[PDB]
Amino acid sequence: TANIDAQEPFSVLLMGIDTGDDTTMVVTINPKENKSTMISLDRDILTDIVGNDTQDKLNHAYAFGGAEMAINTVQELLDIPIHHYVSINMKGLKDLIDAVGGIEVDNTIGEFTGITVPAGKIKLDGTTGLAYARMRHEDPEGDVGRQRRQREVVEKIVRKVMSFDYRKILDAVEANVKTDLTWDDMMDIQSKYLSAFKTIDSEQLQGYSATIDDIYYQVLDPNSLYKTQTTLRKQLGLKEHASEREKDLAFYNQFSYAVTD
């Protein structure tokens, strides 16, 4: 329902699915405040799986009902509307990095796992780009680290894709990307939301370690959850939803007995 033509603030869920026998993110574009907020969603987060009538870790949303179930589940978790979505393969993500001429990042680690990514300020291609985005071992932070690195990659990509260009040649990633976002929608963004990318901010979801049936889950702090929800909601020109605070708390209370902190 977001009117892109009127440069109305909108949101989008970016997913990185590995189709070869995952990563879920949310971005809010708010030109009225010249900023975009990325939001990494941990796969172990415990929530209601909208449509499955159960509560599982967010990760299984897509795995059970594809794109639809994931979009809905996230829409309930963040208490915000997901106007658009995008599914990218590992082959498409690799071609998107090469189609833009690569991207520069600051590798504060320096792993090397059949691909090696150098340390310090270096340029990344499609190949060494996937490794940098996917890695949860050589990082003394795991999830949080990998998540931070995935957001850095997408931030650099978006920054480049919007750095005045290629857009047509980029299509070499179409055969490996799904989206309800049209070409016209893109042209509207690359001429009316340029300011919205002047500053790309981040947001972390505070949670706790937990376990139910010998499975590791993460129970989000309800009060940190509400704050996050209200934040995103305002990014989208929406008002506070105090009613959601009572819901976040209720959910947390029925699962706090599993927290291991």
Residue 29: enclosing H or E segment and its boundaries? strand 23-30
Residue 107: enclosing H or E segment and its boundaries? strand 103-107
What is the total count of domains within the chain? 1
Helices 242-253, 222-235: crossing angle, 10 deg rounding: 150
- CB-CB contact of 150 with 132 (8 Å): no
- CB-CB contact of 210 with 216 (8 Å): yes
CATH number, domain with residue 142: 3.40.630.190
Q: Cα separation of 223 and 242, whole Å?
A: 11
- Among 210, 196, 202, 200, which residue's Cα sits nearest to residue 252? 210
CA 37 to chain centre: 10
3-state secondary structure of 199: coil
Name the experiment that determined this structure.
Answer: X-ray
Q: In what order do the strands lie in the sheet with 35-41?
A: 177-179, 84-88, 10-16, 23-30, 35-41, 200-203
- CB-CB contact of 25 with 12 (8 Å): no
Q: Cα separation of 11 and 80, whole Å?
A: 9
Q: Cα separation of 88 and 82, whole Å?
A: 17
Residue 150: enclosing H or E segment and its boundaries? helix 143-161
- CB-CB contact of 24 with 43 (8 Å): yes
CA atoms within 13 A on the CB side of 230: 13
- Among 104, 158, 108, 113, which residue's Cα sits nearest to residue 131? 113
Q: Which domain holds residue 120?
A: 1-261
Q: Which residues contact 253 (CB under 8 A, 6 or more apart)?
A: none
At 93, list the tokens: 């993500």
Query: Which residues on neighbouring strands pair with residue 57, listed in sequence order?
Result: 46
